[PDB]
Each structure stands twice: as C-alpha cells, then as structure tokens.
Amino acid sequence: GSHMQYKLILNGKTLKGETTTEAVDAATAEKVFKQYANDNGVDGEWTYDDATKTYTVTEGSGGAGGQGMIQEPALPPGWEMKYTSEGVRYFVDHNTRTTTFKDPRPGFE
Numbered sequence: 753g754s755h756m757q758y759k760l761i762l763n764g765k766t767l768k769g770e771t772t773t774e775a776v777d778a779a780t781a782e783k784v785f786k787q788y789a790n791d792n793g794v795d796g797e798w799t800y801d802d803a804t805k806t807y808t809v810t811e812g813s814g815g816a817g818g819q820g821m822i823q824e825p826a827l828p829p830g831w832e833m834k835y836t837s838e839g840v841r842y843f844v845d846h847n848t849r850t851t852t853f854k855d856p857r858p859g860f861e
Contacts (some may be wrong), residue, residue: 757805762794764811781807789825 755774760780762769771788782798789795789809799808827833831842840848843854 753754758785758807759804760788761806761808761810762789762792762811764794766795767792767811767828781805785809 754776755780755812756776758773758775758778760771762771765848771785773781773784773788775784776798786795794809794811795811796810799810800806801808823827830845830847832846833841834844835841841853841855843852845852
C-alpha cells in the first residue's frame, strides 16, 4: 500500500547480483542500499530511472580505449632517449628516475 518497491543492480567485477527493497522514500531507498553495497565493496555512479524505480550502481566510470599500447613515434611523456659517448643507445625512465636499456633489437642481434 504505502510501501513502494525499489530495485538495485550491483554491476561489479567480483560482485554481481540484484536485489529489491521496500521503502516510502527515494532517498531512504538510496541510504539503505548504500550500506548494503558498502559491505560488498560496491560504490559507483549512482544512476536512477523513474519509470522502474531501479537504482543502478555501476562499479567504474569508463573503460577507455581497448587498443593502443604505444604504437606511435617520438618519445612519450617522462621518457628520454640519449646516447653514451660511444654511440650506445640507452633510455631514462624519468618517471621513476632510473636508467633502462629499451631497444627493439633484443641482444642487439
């Protein structure tokens, strides 16, 4: 009667499931399910649809590009390509501040 049903969907990776709760407020339905999702380690962009009273908590914000593992020329941010006084090629991880030998030729053929 005075109680209205509300849904929840936990779109997570190691935590996936659905549930339902009864409340007289929308804010209360949120707050109760937040404590519910909390103990499951699920928090995310809290979306809602007024047609179905479905609260949707998605674990994440985006997925980003699926392919593009550094396949472009030039040096990437924080990288230095410098040579020794003998013409030997070495790289500098300025991100961690260390030297590293990263050449496309393994063993220098």
